[PDB]
Amino acid sequence: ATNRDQESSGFAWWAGNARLINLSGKLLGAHVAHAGLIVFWAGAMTLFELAHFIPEKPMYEQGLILIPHIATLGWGVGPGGEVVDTFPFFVVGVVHLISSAVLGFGGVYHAIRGPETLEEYSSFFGYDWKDKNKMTTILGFHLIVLGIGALLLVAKAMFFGGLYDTWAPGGGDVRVITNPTLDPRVIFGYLLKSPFGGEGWIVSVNNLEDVVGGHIWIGLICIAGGIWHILTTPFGWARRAFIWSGEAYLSYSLGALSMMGFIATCFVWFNNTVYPSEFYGPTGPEASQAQAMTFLIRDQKLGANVGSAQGPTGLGKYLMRSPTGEIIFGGETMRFWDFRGPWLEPLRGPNGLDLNKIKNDIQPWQERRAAEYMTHAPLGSLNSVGGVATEINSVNFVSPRSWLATSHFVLAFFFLVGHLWHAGRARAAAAGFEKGIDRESEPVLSMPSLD
Amino acid sequence: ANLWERFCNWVTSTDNRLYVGWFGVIMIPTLLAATICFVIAFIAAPPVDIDGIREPVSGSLLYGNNIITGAVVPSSNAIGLHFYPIWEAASLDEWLYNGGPYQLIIFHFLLGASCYMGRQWELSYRLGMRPWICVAYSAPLASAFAVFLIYPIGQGSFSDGMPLGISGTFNFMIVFQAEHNILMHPFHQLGVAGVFGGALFCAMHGSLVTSSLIRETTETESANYGYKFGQEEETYNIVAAHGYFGRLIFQYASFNNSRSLHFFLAAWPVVGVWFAALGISTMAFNLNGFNFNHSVIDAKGNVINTWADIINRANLGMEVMHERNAHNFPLDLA
Amino acid sequence: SYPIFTVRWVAVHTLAVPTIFFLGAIAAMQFIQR
Amino acid sequence: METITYVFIFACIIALFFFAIFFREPPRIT
Amino acid sequence: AELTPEVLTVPLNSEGKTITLTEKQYLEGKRLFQYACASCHVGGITKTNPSLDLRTETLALATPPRDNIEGLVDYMKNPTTYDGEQEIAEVHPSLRSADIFPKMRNLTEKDLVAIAGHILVEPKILGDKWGGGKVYY
Amino acid sequence: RGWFDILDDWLKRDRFVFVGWSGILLFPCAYLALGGWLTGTTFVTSWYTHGLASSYLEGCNFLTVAVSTPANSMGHSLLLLWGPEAQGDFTRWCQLGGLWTFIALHGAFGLIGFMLRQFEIARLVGVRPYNAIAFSAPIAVFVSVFLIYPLGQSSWFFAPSFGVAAIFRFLLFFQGFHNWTLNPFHMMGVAGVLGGALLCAIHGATVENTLFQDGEGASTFRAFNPTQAEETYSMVTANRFWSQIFGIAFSNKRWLHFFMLFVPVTGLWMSAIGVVGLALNLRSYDFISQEIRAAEDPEFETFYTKNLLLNEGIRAWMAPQDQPHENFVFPEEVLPRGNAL
Amino acid sequence: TTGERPFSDIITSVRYWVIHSITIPALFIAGWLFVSTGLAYDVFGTPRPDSYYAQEQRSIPLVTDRFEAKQQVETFLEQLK
Ligand code: CLA
Ligand code: CLA
Ligand code: CLA
Ligand code: CLA
Ligand code: CLA
Ligand code: CLA
Ligand SMILES: CC1=C(/C=C/C(C)=C/C=C/C(C)=C/C=C/C=C(C)/C=C/C=C(C)/C=C/C2=C(C)CCCC2(C)C)C(C)(C)CCC1
Ligand SMILES: CC1=C(/C=C/C(C)=C/C=C/C(C)=C/C=C/C=C(C)/C=C/C=C(C)/C=C/C2=C(C)CCCC2(C)C)C(C)(C)CCC1
Ligand SMILES: CC1=C(/C=C/C(C)=C/C=C/C(C)=C/C=C/C=C(C)/C=C/C=C(C)/C=C/C2=C(C)CCCC2(C)C)C(C)(C)CCC1
Ligand SMILES: CCCCCCCS[C@@H]1O[C@H](CO)[C@@H](O)[C@H](O)[C@H]1O
Ligand SMILES: CCCCCCCS[C@@H]1O[C@H](CO)[C@@H](O)[C@H](O)[C@H]1O
Ligand code: OEX
Ligand SMILES: [Ca+2]
Ligand SMILES: [Cl-]
Ligand SMILES: [Cl-]
Ligand SMILES: [Fe+2]
């Protein structure tokens, strides 16, 4: 049993997987078995969601996170995001579940039966962490794989039925994207937008042409990059900047996944384009604005003149100005005036909310949607009692947006920690003092006193 | 060496009384700016319209506060999450009215304190130490990020960031209780176990090491003189300490390995505090404490209150009173 | 050869015995309906 | 007078930090 | 105290007839009210218009009267403003508007009766809490 | 060598669980305090004393169960099972809150037993009794909060009830009624608890990160031996590290460890002193200068005035259910509320 | 090293399990029946779900007299009728 105790490996059981660092065969098994676990969950969780699913309640009233992802791709839904066929969901679940058996088979085989190291077996599949060119080649294969993944999304949107478009003229619907945004000024312009309010960096993406165009770019960047890394070896300045070890590379990826986790958190919290409110529920900003809209409609029906109604502080009770003058809802939702959503936008003019439109053009479907969103705000308890923290038991609800934001924050946070842990460890191991200070060569002892 | 080389050598020098380092080149100016602005604002800033309702709250000493009541007041709810640097204001007077010092301070501070953490890794590397002191500091750091950045992001405004001041801190806590029932949240409960337990284990370790110091001094001198900086020999008897504590409880509940003990002392508070930070950072997205309001019902359907319902009434008091002129609509949704 | 009935044995049962009785009581409670 | 007092105590504490750091008794291996 | 046949006896119509609901109808009514109505009407208030609640005295003064099974069942098919003047199916869940309020698509006549009986029985249990709001929590 | 010394021998045998003369006080008191808590939280109501359900039997969960204080009309009755209230009736005694004084009083004697145990063991093993000395802080907290506080109030009703949610209620009560956050003795408590948690984390991390390489293993715990003479980590390197990061550093390990006792122990003792003032409603509730200014100037607002508005809401909203013996009826129209909410 | 039998000896022995596969389930069942029979309510004086209030009453039965508190509770119990 090669290296499967502390004496021989130098690693205790609780650091057991570090015993795998230089055993490329068993480590391939660990990786493939784990990819199995991810695929298993995607498949099983979907079947579970589908079994529990009542197609005439909103998804977001049903604790669903995976059906909403399938529906955003335009599968299984029609106008308004109404479920028209659950069979695409069943297919996604079954096919992942079946695929996980295969991955789990390969993982178990590599992990316990196959060759422990691959280097003797094959010079193509074997690798030395310290072989910079081999590391960049494998990285290159994976980049090409990822760019093909990104182009699968583009193929779905342009050639295989489209995507769910909450912004579609006349009402949300599945729509084929025929004119994806190619202009790099628009695509890369997102990357240079501020992440602060009213701007929101990439999270502000608000139309499927930009989404599809971005993935066209990203797919080509990733395939070009992958070819690059297969054809080159790292340059001198990169050689001198990094640590070249399995543990260092892990650290870099932990750092990157952490960053992606925080971004995903903000994406599901604020973005209502690639996370349609039809499927995920209203965003926090959306539901607060929907409350102001609800009472503006109510009191205006009763006779209030909502443009000239002064609230207790002197600011408009329903309507006021943003710091740059745009007309926006009043009360605490003043903070949310950068919110944009298909049910509100028909009321917006060049100067912000239009009082003429408010007085004359508000349709019953806007009243309904604002009422629905106001009463499904993403607030709720850990035991899924919907509403404010003092609300009574009655409504079983926590928004999928809160589930997805909180889980991803927690994950991103612990991944930053793992980044620091592994990056600091990789540095120390490379320099040779990860196990402690040499008592006969204690560096501080050869340094001058501070004073 | 050339100029650049010499500069690098000085920056990364292990011989500077305070380590500078590359993290330090960002840390030094950002922490100085945050400090200077805080000091001046705490003394002399005019009232700030925190809730965007033209109702300015006085935070500074010269405008009627003492050390306990004073604060640098969060930026205006009218601003929300918009970036409000000095040059976005038409004047300093406007910048002050709207709570611009708060943003300048918390952004330079969070950047500088993140660099403080990197700098702890950096020095440990220069000295040939193991690297994870910085991972311990990530716990208070993560908590500062939760209250000054993540909570404002979730709620949509830096006006809901923790104020920089003693009473404003309590204000943030009471309102947080009303809106999230944090006490009933298990991540805050783990936090409490982390800091009460950190204190307990701090006192325990202190008292056990102190109890077993080896006699090296007379009664007319401090026993502290019994230890000399840099001596090779341990200064207490671990075997007597364990002999003591294993009998206090029972043998196997006591640590006989100092490395194990010290790791536990690091891990218990740090992990609990990571959960505290994560409680704040996930209540930021309104996944709130347990809600057992009216959970216990009799055979007819009468509500039989429990202590959870009494909590609920205190929370209602906070909720209905906070920011008493800011709400126009019946639900407080952020 | 070890004794069976020791101070430790008593200490253990003073806790274990009511704990199991209580866990059975609390298990039964989960089936109580108003 | 109160503000002066608060700022005075604070400024003393800042001075104290300066002396405690730069004018500490130096630690000596001995 | 118990949930007795008497607590479960509520007005069927405006003409003095009552109906005694079974314990199972009471449970179905709670479940269905939670399913279709409690998002706005938790606890007997109305979140999108707090001026109107589901208290029995309030329902009695509605036009047509809504303090009986028939008035409530008819409300769930063809809801009106409080004075009977406007039909509001376009903005309030009802069978007539099951097309735009899809949760109403599965509700049967028996389900409407169960929801009605919930609205009438709950204040007999909860007194001022029903329709009281947070003051009475 | 009479019976006293023979008993002494037996009490002091080196066994899995040490007994001692202290064990005779400690074991029964601690067992009953803990058993009384488990018994009440599992089976016992607070219907007659508080109007609350409080046990698993009634449907509470681990967070909401409690053993609750007796009714306010009991005053500070010892509430002895054989006393004039329960008159020997175990059922009635449960219903009147007798388990509350049962747990608080056996708990108090049990803590005395525990501290005697720390002294007794230190003495036998030949170490200095600083662990017992440090334990005075838990004792000062228990005694101030569970005994002195209700003794200065109307009755045991206002002591904390033994329960997770119940203790949370006790925190929120102290905010709304005593403004206890404003109290500099509580603030010193906070600094010594958080300061102690800081010291615990930073010292554990420092030792673990200045370790000497004493084995070949990448998992470094095995490279220590209890009986070894040498320090397992470098004080000199640790000292340099913190001197350069923070400005100062420990240089004396005896001082370091003494300070780790001093800080959280001192914090707890300070918070206890504040709670003794609160027994008498002797609060730090207000800054008089603040109130005089705010009464005359309706534009003057600080976070201090804001938190008193929150306190007034807590008191008005919670008192009628939290203090049922007062029979409070507060009409809707008197309840303090801001706009809309 | 204090004389008693190691726990891990005890709990991996067949005799331990012969004894405990009886006494553990026996205790658990006895706890179960303490509740299922209703005995727990009677010993501790805890209301059953139908016993918090009389049919029409909505005031809690708060004890208000220290020395007659026993009788007051008895009186509250009688009124459940
Ligand atoms: C892709 C991500 C990734 C990978 C491949 C690794 C891989 C590795 N880590 Mg790193 N790590 C990560 C992310 C990762 N880590 C994160 C996000 C953190 C922050 C917590 C860490 C923190 C960390 C530490 C502190 C250490 C490692 C170590 C190691 C090595 C040994 C791991 C081992 O055997 O664990 C064995 C696994 C366990 C003992 C199980 C841990 C259980 C966790 C704590 C709880 C999970 C809770 C669960 C999600 C919910 C509840 C479950 C339910 C049953 C109730 C190995 C190289 C060791 C090392 O440095 O070696 C070089 C080591 O000491 N890791
Ligand atoms: C995703 C989780 C994960 C994965 C994929 C692995 C993977 C692996 N581990 Mg790590 N490990 C983990 C979590 C994981 N570990 C955790 C949480 C801990 C802390 C408890 C450890 C602690 C640990 C230690 C201490 C060691 C490993 C070692 C190993 C490797 C050798 C295993 C072996 O020899 O088994 C022997 C076991 C068996 C023969 C029993 C059966 C095991 C199989 C895989 C179960 C398969 C069940 C599955 C349902 C089958 C489906 C088949 C179907 C598809 C047809 C293997 C690559 C070893 C090593 O590195 O060797 C070089 C090693 O010494 N691990
Ligand atoms: C991204 C991860 C993710 C997210 C956002 C969700 C979201 C959701 N799930 Mg899903 N799920 C997941 C992963 C996730 N799940 C996993 C891994 C499983 C396998 C166990 C499931 C299996 C599952 C089932 C079977 C069900 C759900 C359901 C739900 C809903 C209710 C959740 C709930 O009530 O939680 C309750 C909250 C908890 C149990 C608390 C979790 C706390 C963890 C332990 C803290 C983690 C800390 C960290 C990871 C550890 C680090 C330690 C440190 C030392 C390093 C909600 C939409 C329910 C539903 O509505 O379906 C329709 C439902 O029945 N899920
Ligand atoms: C990343 C995953 C991965 C990698 C790098 C490897 C690598 C290796 N495998 Mg393992 N394996 C895997 C996953 C993997 N395998 C899975 C999922 C299974 C279960 C089906 C197995 C079951 C398995 C067995 C039973 C054996 C190997 C063997 C080998 C070695 C020889 C392979 C060869 O010569 O193929 C050369 C190329 C081909 C045979 C044609 C490849 C055609 C592929 C399938 C096209 C797929 C396209 C696309 C990229 C797939 C996307 C998948 C994604 C959606 C998940 C080599 C070390 C052998 C071994 O180790 O000898 C001792 C061996 O006996 N593998
Ligand atoms: C997983 C993706 C991935 C990974 C891990 C790598 C890894 C590597 N790359 Mg490849 N690369 C990729 C994808 C990737 N690459 C793709 C898709 C392309 C095509 C565009 C390339 C094209 C490429 C070139 C042309 C080169 C590399 C080089 C390298 C090496 C040094 C990288 C470095 O110093 O970055 C660190 C980045 C810098 C030092 C740039 C300045 C840092 C600024 C401050 C970052 C600003 C961003 C900030 C964090 C905020 C984020 C948002 C922002 C967009 C506003 C290393 C082996 C070099 C090499 O050695 O080739 C052999 C090199 O010359 N790569
Ligand atoms: C060291 C163990 C210990 C200690 C310190 C206590 C202490 C206490 N118990 Mg606990 N108890 C114990 C073990 C202990 N108990 C055990 C083992 C049981 C199970 C039987 C109990 C069961 C128990 C119950 C059921 C109750 C108490 C109660 C009390 C309180 C009042 C006791 C009292 O007034 O005694 C008075 C007696 C003495 C102080 C003994 C005096 C001895 C002197 C020095 C000698 C004189 C005696 C003389 C010869 C007799 C002549 C009488 C003649 C005139 C007729 C007090 C906190 C009560 C309480 O908690 O109420 C809230 C209560 O109801 N205890
Ligand atoms: C290495 C290792 C490990 C790991 C392992 C793993 C991770 C594995 C994986 C595995 C896997 C990952 C597996 C999988 C499996 C799967 C399967 C077996 C599947 C199946 C399917 C089916 C059978 C289907 C069915 C159906 C249908 C088709 C329809 C609908 C309905 C149903 C569902 C019925 C551990 C940790 C232990 C440690 C040791 C070493
Ligand atoms: C798809 C999509 C899109 C697009 C996207 C894109 C186009 C992206 C890009 C992206 C990118 C383009 C990114 C980048 C990144 C970068 C990074 C992340 C960097 C990093 C760096 C580092 C980490 C460094 C480090 C260092 C330093 C700094 C110093 C020296 C040392 C070292 C090297 C360590 C849009 C939005 C339109 C829409 C939606 C969809
Ligand atoms: C009061 C009284 C008394 C006494 C009594 C006693 C002494 C009792 C005891 C009792 C007991 C002694 C009981 C016990 C119970 C137990 C239980 C009920 C437990 C449970 C547990 C659990 C449930 C666990 C859980 C957990 C944790 C904790 C952590 C880990 C994880 C888990 C989750 C597993 C006498 C007669 C003198 C007199 C009169 C009064
Ligand atoms: C990797 C497996 C992918 C299986 C591909 C299924 C095609 S997807 C299919 O495409 C049609 C146009 O051809 C669309 O009209 C339809 O809406 C869509 O469901
Ligand atoms: C509970 C112990 C406190 C009382 C101690 C008084 C001891 S009394 C003492 O007892 C001896 C045996 O121990 C006898 O030999 C002796 O005659 C007698 O005077
Ligand atoms: O700002 Mn500060 O506090 Ca968060 O909730 Mn809404 O907004 Mn306002 O009320 Mn409640
Ligand atoms: Ca029943
Ligand atoms: Cl407030
Ligand atoms: Cl509002
Ligand atoms: Fe220590």
PDB file of N, CA and C in Angstrom, chain A residues 404-447:
ATOM      1  N   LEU A 404     -29.121  31.118  -3.339  1.00  0.00           N
ATOM      2  CA  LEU A 404     -27.965  31.064  -4.221  1.00  0.00           C
ATOM      3  C   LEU A 404     -26.878  32.118  -3.840  1.00  0.00           C
ATOM      4  N   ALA A 405     -27.301  33.301  -3.419  1.00  0.00           N
ATOM      5  CA  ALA A 405     -26.324  34.309  -2.962  1.00  0.00           C
ATOM      6  C   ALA A 405     -25.627  33.891  -1.682  1.00  0.00           C
ATOM      7  N   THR A 406     -26.365  33.357  -0.681  1.00  0.00           N
ATOM      8  CA  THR A 406     -25.722  33.090   0.570  1.00  0.00           C
ATOM      9  C   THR A 406     -24.769  31.903   0.436  1.00  0.00           C
ATOM     10  N   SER A 407     -25.214  30.812  -0.187  1.00  0.00           N
ATOM     11  CA  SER A 407     -24.366  29.652  -0.376  1.00  0.00           C
ATOM     12  C   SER A 407     -23.083  30.023  -1.105  1.00  0.00           C
ATOM     13  N   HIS A 408     -23.218  30.802  -2.163  1.00  0.00           N
ATOM     14  CA  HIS A 408     -22.028  31.202  -2.922  1.00  0.00           C
ATOM     15  C   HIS A 408     -21.121  32.169  -2.225  1.00  0.00           C
ATOM     16  N   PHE A 409     -21.687  32.978  -1.307  1.00  0.00           N
ATOM     17  CA  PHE A 409     -20.808  33.804  -0.492  1.00  0.00           C
ATOM     18  C   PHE A 409     -19.988  32.926   0.442  1.00  0.00           C
ATOM     19  N   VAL A 410     -20.635  31.968   1.133  1.00  0.00           N
ATOM     20  CA  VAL A 410     -19.967  31.121   2.041  1.00  0.00           C
ATOM     21  C   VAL A 410     -18.874  30.325   1.345  1.00  0.00           C
ATOM     22  N   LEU A 411     -19.203  29.796   0.191  1.00  0.00           N
ATOM     23  CA  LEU A 411     -18.241  29.012  -0.586  1.00  0.00           C
ATOM     24  C   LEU A 411     -17.068  29.883  -1.060  1.00  0.00           C
ATOM     25  N   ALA A 412     -17.364  31.034  -1.662  1.00  0.00           N
ATOM     26  CA  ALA A 412     -16.315  31.986  -2.084  1.00  0.00           C
ATOM     27  C   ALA A 412     -15.421  32.378  -0.921  1.00  0.00           C
ATOM     28  N   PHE A 413     -16.034  32.627   0.261  1.00  0.00           N
ATOM     29  CA  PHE A 413     -15.242  33.004   1.419  1.00  0.00           C
ATOM     30  C   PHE A 413     -14.294  31.887   1.831  1.00  0.00           C
ATOM     31  N   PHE A 414     -14.811  30.688   2.056  1.00  0.00           N
ATOM     32  CA  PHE A 414     -13.898  29.608   2.453  1.00  0.00           C
ATOM     33  C   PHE A 414     -12.854  29.304   1.343  1.00  0.00           C
ATOM     34  N   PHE A 415     -13.193  29.546   0.088  1.00  0.00           N
ATOM     35  CA  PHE A 415     -12.182  29.368  -1.003  1.00  0.00           C
ATOM     36  C   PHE A 415     -11.084  30.415  -1.001  1.00  0.00           C
ATOM     37  N   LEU A 416     -11.394  31.622  -0.527  1.00  0.00           N
ATOM     38  CA  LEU A 416     -10.341  32.622  -0.326  1.00  0.00           C
ATOM     39  C   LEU A 416      -9.468  32.141   0.782  1.00  0.00           C
ATOM     40  N   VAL A 417     -10.080  31.621   1.880  1.00  0.00           N
ATOM     41  CA  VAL A 417      -9.269  31.101   2.939  1.00  0.00           C
ATOM     42  C   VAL A 417      -8.318  29.956   2.424  1.00  0.00           C
ATOM     43  N   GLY A 418      -8.854  29.078   1.595  1.00  0.00           N
ATOM     44  CA  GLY A 418      -8.076  27.944   1.129  1.00  0.00           C
ATOM     45  C   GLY A 418      -6.992  28.461   0.186  1.00  0.00           C
ATOM     46  N   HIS A 419      -7.323  29.507  -0.574  1.00  0.00           N
ATOM     47  CA  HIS A 419      -6.284  30.149  -1.370  1.00  0.00           C
ATOM     48  C   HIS A 419      -5.113  30.617  -0.479  1.00  0.00           C
ATOM     49  N   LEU A 420      -5.413  31.290   0.637  1.00  0.00           N
ATOM     50  CA  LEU A 420      -4.341  31.841   1.486  1.00  0.00           C
ATOM     51  C   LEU A 420      -3.585  30.677   2.120  1.00  0.00           C
ATOM     52  N   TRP A 421      -4.330  29.686   2.609  1.00  0.00           N
ATOM     53  CA  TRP A 421      -3.729  28.566   3.235  1.00  0.00           C
ATOM     54  C   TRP A 421      -2.714  27.862   2.302  1.00  0.00           C
ATOM     55  N   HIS A 422      -3.146  27.565   1.079  1.00  0.00           N
ATOM     56  CA  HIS A 422      -2.334  26.819   0.100  1.00  0.00           C
ATOM     57  C   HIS A 422      -1.275  27.642  -0.553  1.00  0.00           C
ATOM     58  N   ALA A 423      -1.570  28.912  -0.826  1.00  0.00           N
ATOM     59  CA  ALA A 423      -0.556  29.821  -1.397  1.00  0.00           C
ATOM     60  C   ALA A 423       0.562  30.031  -0.380  1.00  0.00           C
ATOM     61  N   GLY A 424       0.203  30.252   0.896  1.00  0.00           N
ATOM     62  CA  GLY A 424       1.276  30.423   1.890  1.00  0.00           C
ATOM     63  C   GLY A 424       2.054  29.119   2.112  1.00  0.00           C
ATOM     64  N   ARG A 425       1.349  27.995   2.008  1.00  0.00           N
ATOM     65  CA  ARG A 425       2.011  26.713   2.222  1.00  0.00           C
ATOM     66  C   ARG A 425       2.920  26.407   1.027  1.00  0.00           C
ATOM     67  N   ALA A 426       2.445  26.669  -0.194  1.00  0.00           N
ATOM     68  CA  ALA A 426       3.240  26.386  -1.413  1.00  0.00           C
ATOM     69  C   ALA A 426       4.551  27.189  -1.402  1.00  0.00           C
ATOM     70  N   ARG A 427       4.472  28.483  -1.055  1.00  0.00           N
ATOM     71  CA  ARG A 427       5.653  29.322  -0.823  1.00  0.00           C
ATOM     72  C   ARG A 427       6.588  28.723   0.182  1.00  0.00           C
ATOM     73  N   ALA A 428       6.087  28.385   1.374  1.00  0.00           N
ATOM     74  CA  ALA A 428       6.983  27.871   2.375  1.00  0.00           C
ATOM     75  C   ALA A 428       7.651  26.524   1.967  1.00  0.00           C
ATOM     76  N   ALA A 429       6.872  25.653   1.325  1.00  0.00           N
ATOM     77  CA  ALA A 429       7.369  24.306   0.928  1.00  0.00           C
ATOM     78  C   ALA A 429       8.437  24.445  -0.126  1.00  0.00           C
ATOM     79  N   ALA A 430       8.228  25.389  -1.040  1.00  0.00           N
ATOM     80  CA  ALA A 430       9.162  25.620  -2.146  1.00  0.00           C
ATOM     81  C   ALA A 430      10.478  26.148  -1.595  1.00  0.00           C
ATOM     82  N   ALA A 431      10.414  26.916  -0.503  1.00  0.00           N
ATOM     83  CA  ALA A 431      11.606  27.561   0.015  1.00  0.00           C
ATOM     84  C   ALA A 431      12.187  26.651   1.087  1.00  0.00           C
ATOM     85  N   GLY A 432      11.439  25.610   1.433  1.00  0.00           N
ATOM     86  CA  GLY A 432      11.939  24.584   2.306  1.00  0.00           C
ATOM     87  C   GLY A 432      11.751  24.790   3.813  1.00  0.00           C
ATOM     88  N   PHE A 433      10.789  25.602   4.252  1.00  0.00           N
ATOM     89  CA  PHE A 433      10.561  25.692   5.727  1.00  0.00           C
ATOM     90  C   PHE A 433       9.077  25.474   6.177  1.00  0.00           C
ATOM     91  N   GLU A 434       8.297  24.765   5.370  1.00  0.00           N
ATOM     92  CA  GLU A 434       6.918  24.356   5.758  1.00  0.00           C
ATOM     93  C   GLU A 434       6.778  23.450   7.007  1.00  0.00           C
ATOM     94  N   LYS A 435       7.862  22.861   7.508  1.00  0.00           N
ATOM     95  CA  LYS A 435       7.736  21.938   8.648  1.00  0.00           C
ATOM     96  C   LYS A 435       8.267  22.559   9.897  1.00  0.00           C
ATOM     97  N   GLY A 436       8.673  23.824   9.790  1.00  0.00           N
ATOM     98  CA  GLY A 436       9.227  24.518  10.942  1.00  0.00           C
ATOM     99  C   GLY A 436      10.640  25.053  10.668  1.00  0.00           C
ATOM    100  N   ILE A 437      11.192  25.758  11.654  1.00  0.00           N
ATOM    101  CA  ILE A 437      12.437  26.527  11.544  1.00  0.00           C
ATOM    102  C   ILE A 437      13.536  25.535  11.898  1.00  0.00           C
ATOM    103  N   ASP A 438      14.589  25.516  11.105  1.00  0.00           N
ATOM    104  CA  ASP A 438      15.774  24.688  11.468  1.00  0.00           C
ATOM    105  C   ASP A 438      16.426  25.246  12.736  1.00  0.00           C
ATOM    106  N   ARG A 439      16.410  24.489  13.836  1.00  0.00           N
ATOM    107  CA  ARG A 439      16.995  24.988  15.069  1.00  0.00           C
ATOM    108  C   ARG A 439      18.464  25.435  14.964  1.00  0.00           C
ATOM    109  N   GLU A 440      19.245  24.781  14.098  1.00  0.00           N
ATOM    110  CA  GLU A 440      20.656  25.159  13.918  1.00  0.00           C
ATOM    111  C   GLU A 440      20.855  26.198  12.828  1.00  0.00           C
ATOM    112  N   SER A 441      19.805  26.527  12.092  1.00  0.00           N
ATOM    113  CA  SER A 441      19.907  27.594  11.103  1.00  0.00           C
ATOM    114  C   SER A 441      18.685  28.528  11.180  1.00  0.00           C
ATOM    115  N   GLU A 442      18.408  29.083  12.370  1.00  0.00           N
ATOM    116  CA  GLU A 442      17.209  29.933  12.557  1.00  0.00           C
ATOM    117  C   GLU A 442      17.454  31.310  11.925  1.00  0.00           C
ATOM    118  N   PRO A 443      16.785  31.648  10.812  1.00  0.00           N
ATOM    119  CA  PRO A 443      17.141  32.850  10.047  1.00  0.00           C
ATOM    120  C   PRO A 443      17.240  34.119  10.906  1.00  0.00           C
ATOM    121  N   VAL A 444      16.315  34.299  11.865  1.00  0.00           N
ATOM    122  CA  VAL A 444      16.283  35.544  12.634  1.00  0.00           C
ATOM    123  C   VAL A 444      17.570  35.711  13.452  1.00  0.00           C
ATOM    124  N   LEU A 445      18.166  34.586  13.818  1.00  0.00           N
ATOM    125  CA  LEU A 445      19.369  34.617  14.633  1.00  0.00           C
ATOM    126  C   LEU A 445      20.580  35.197  13.878  1.00  0.00           C
ATOM    127  N   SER A 446      20.569  35.197  12.537  1.00  0.00           N
ATOM    128  CA  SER A 446      21.643  35.849  11.779  1.00  0.00           C
ATOM    129  C   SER A 446      21.266  37.226  11.323  1.00  0.00           C
ATOM    130  N   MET A 447      20.146  37.740  11.829  1.00  0.00           N
ATOM    131  CA  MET A 447      19.778  39.098  11.447  1.00  0.00           C
ATOM    132  C   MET A 447      20.196  40.084  12.557  1.00  0.00           C
TER     133      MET A 447
END
